[PDB]
Design a protein around this nucleic acid. Structure first.
Ligand SMILES: [Ca+2]
Ligand SMILES: [Mn+2]
Ligand SMILES: [Mn+2]
Length: 430
DNA sequence: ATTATGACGCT
DNA sequence: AGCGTCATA
């Protein structure tokens, strides 16, 4: 009891842009606003592949990974925006630059960890402490939380969605002990006040809407964020975890969506996160290893210690292209032309990176896939990256992979290449 | 014939 | 180092 940690020491938020590439395109083209619409890459093959979908289009059943031609069968009036093509490939620069807009605003409030192109974690523990001393034991008004859900409320002894949200928020605020500067629930609440402010700033200054989760760690904050999308934020308290987890499929928790989560389910014969509490730490470590076992033991109790890392910039800069089915690269000059295309985009992004961020990459990673291999990558080789020159990088890439060519004819490439990948890594200050 | 990424774990 | 896992638009 007295010595049992509860993982309530931090306030952590996760901010995730709603339908992000779609919002980037809707800001640019007002005709797409408030419409079923999606973002697609390429066209020729089945109308192109969908990579983002507006909430209006989701109502028709449109999803990511859908071919646009198939999406049009569900939603005939679906509007589409295409990813830019440069040097024969999709080019995601517009969305990377829009990401920077948002990340720079968030950084004004706190240290952030860039977790994807459209989301970052925030450690708000310090900011909350400051805001609490500004508040002077003064109660938090519902007006300060106009888009916040309190997960698990209302409960106990109106049929509209916004009405339910306010009911829950009222119950929460009615219970709050604002006289205690160290109450975790109060700290989360002030955290939510700050995230309302952050989200207002993002929308004001970019036009983009986002959702957010506020909790005591990254996993709960990420989970919370998704609970009420779009354009809303959700507070998941330590106390809300047993009920939340009692019906929460294991695969919904970050890092458990794949093989490990499948094994937790199969080996233990359970379905929900909460069911993990019935195993000892040693039992979990026996099945899933020392690190995963300890992580699972604490996580199913709502506790996790992974820090919000102070990193706003990506650690690698990469440029990849698939060559599916019949477009697979079967000649040396094909291979060399596409290495150059990739290397030219890589040089452009690397040079911009060096100017913006005062750093230089020092290692070039080259990866290919061969036709037939089920694995995404077949072969990965590194070499020195000593100069930002596309022709040098592409010549070097060819050198490190050219021995993969089984063909007795050096003119021909076999087995044909179905993927090329160039990645700059190992940055040093400059 | 989802594709284009990007972080981190294992040995 | 090279490979695998898991994640996001
Ligand atoms: Ca998003
Ligand atoms: Mn996201
Ligand atoms: Mn998504």
């Amino acid at each position: 009891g007295p010595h049992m940690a509860t993982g309530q020491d931090r306030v952590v938020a996760l901010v995730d842009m709603d339908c992000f590439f779609v919002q980037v395109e809707q800001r640019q083209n007002p005709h797409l606003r408030n419409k079923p619409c999606a973002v697609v890459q390429y066209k020729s093959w089945k109308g192109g592949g969908i990579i983002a979908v507006s909430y209006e289009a989701r109502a028709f059943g449109v999803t990511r990974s859908m071919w646009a031609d198939d999406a049009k069968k569900l939603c005939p009036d679906l509007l589409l925006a295409q990813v830019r093509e440069s040097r024969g490939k999709a080019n995601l620069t517009k969305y990377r630059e829009a990401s920077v807009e948002v990340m720079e605003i968030m950084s004004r409030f706190a240290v952030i960890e860039r977790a994807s192109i459209d989301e970052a974690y925030v450690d708000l523990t310090s900011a909350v402490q400051e805001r609490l001393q500004k508040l002077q034991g003064q109660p938090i008004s519902a007006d300060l939380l106009p888009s916040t859900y309190i997960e698990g409320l209302p409960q106990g002894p109106t049929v509209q969605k916004e009405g339910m949200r306010k009911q829950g928020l009222f119950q929460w605020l009615d219970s709050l002990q604002i006289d205690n500067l160290t109450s975790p629930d109060l700290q989360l609440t002030v955290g939510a006040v700050i995230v309302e402010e952050m989200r207002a700033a993002i929308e004001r200054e970019t036009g983009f809407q986002c959702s957010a989760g506020i909790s005591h760690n990254k996993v709960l904050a990420k989970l919370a964020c998704g609970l009420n999308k779009p354009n809303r934020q959700t507070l998941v308290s330590h106390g809300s975890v047993p009920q939340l987890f009692s019906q929460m499929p294991i695969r919904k928790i970050r890092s458990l969506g794949g093989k490990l989560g499948a094994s937790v389910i199969e080996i233990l014969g359970i379905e929900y996160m909460g069911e993990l509490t019935q195993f000892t730490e040693s039992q979990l470590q026996s099945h899933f290893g020392e690190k995963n076992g300890s992580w699972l033991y604490a996580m199913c109790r709502g506790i996790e210690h992974d820090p919000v890392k102070p990193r706003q910039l990506p650690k690698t800069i990469g440029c990849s292209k698939n060559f599916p089915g019949k477009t697979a690269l079967a000649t040396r000059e094909q291979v060399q032309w596409w290495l150059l295309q990739l290397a030219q985009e890589l040089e452009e992004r690397l040079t911009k990176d060096r100017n913006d961020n005062d750093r230089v990459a020092t290692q070039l990673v080259v990866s290919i896939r061969v036709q037939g291999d089920k694995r995404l990558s077949s072969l990965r080789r590194c070499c020195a990256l000593t100069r930002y020159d596309a022709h040098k990088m592409s010549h070097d890439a060819f050198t490190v992979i050219k021995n993969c060519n089984t063909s007795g004819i050096q003119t021909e490439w076999s087995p044909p290449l179905t993927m090329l990948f160039l990645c700059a890594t190992k940055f040093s200050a400059s």
